[PDB]
Amino acid sequence: DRGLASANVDFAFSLYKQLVLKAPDKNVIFSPLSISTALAFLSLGAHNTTLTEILKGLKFNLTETSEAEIHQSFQHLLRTLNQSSDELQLSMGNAMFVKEQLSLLDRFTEDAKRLYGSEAFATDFQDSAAAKKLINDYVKNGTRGKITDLIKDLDSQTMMVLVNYIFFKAKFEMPFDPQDTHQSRFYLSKKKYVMVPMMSLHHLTIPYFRDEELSCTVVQLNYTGNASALFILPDQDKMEEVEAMLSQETLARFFDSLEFREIGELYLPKFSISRDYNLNDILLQLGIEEAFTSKADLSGITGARNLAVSQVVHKAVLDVFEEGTEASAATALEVLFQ
């Protein structure tokens, strides 16, 4: 579905811009797909303005696709994103953790399972340590150990937590030889540099594009015929300029402008980074507001307007090494009674 695809890319760039704003010089790693999926799952239970604000915030156009088509599109996408080969492992899961006695509508639990693959796990949130273990263990299992403490603090009066995780592990089509990894300078700025393990490949032909107008070089390293890593290298002191040009339109132009080119040498650091975020401020900035206030309408969940979002958290990791890449993320939407 090109409609889902376009919305999800637009949302990714909107989120990226606001994550950078938190701390413009820090490393960033996140899964926009995880966050889109988690919020689309939430919208299954939302009505009226709460609903339209979520779907519009996710960059969907409700005049061109209905709510039902959006959920059908997520259902299809999720079924595609659970796959395994010798070259690529991908998993994505959704779950709900619910106070046991909370009455949920059958339509919601049926739809959550059918559309989002979500079970419902009975959770005693007043035993906060046990509830956090149940949730964190689910994310740890789904991410094969890579995300283990998504939930740090959790209100003892929580009613529900909706969770999405994504796991990705892939081999490069052209792996780096570890014998060619050496300590080399990495310029944090023109005047600040440290030594890092720098992988290298020689005499390789890959998709390449020099964007002189944006002062950046773009290359693509494949994992399979469908999954790839697009790298964007701004010239020195042009990172902020390139960031200012990012959009779906610009990314598509990068892809459309790639051409195979012979590369004498490619140098890429071996690295592993991790970030975690609270997304409340960003989601409010993106127009998702009623879900956080006493005006919230999540009555598709319970049959009353008795729930609202309290906290949205996201954690993501990215590990790049000679043989390939591993990346994982998870998103939790914590919900209180009202």
Partner: protein, 31 residues
């Protein structure tokens, strides 16, 4: 031609089958 990622860069992990961005990253310090 030489491409040397010795300064801040972006990495976007994508899937062509679905046209999806799985992960987006900016590496300002890999250490």
């Amino acid at each position: 031609t030489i491409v040397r990622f010795n300064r801040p860069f972006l990495m976007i992990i994508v899937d062509h089958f679905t046209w999806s961005i799985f992960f987006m990253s900016k590496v300002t310090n890999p250490k």
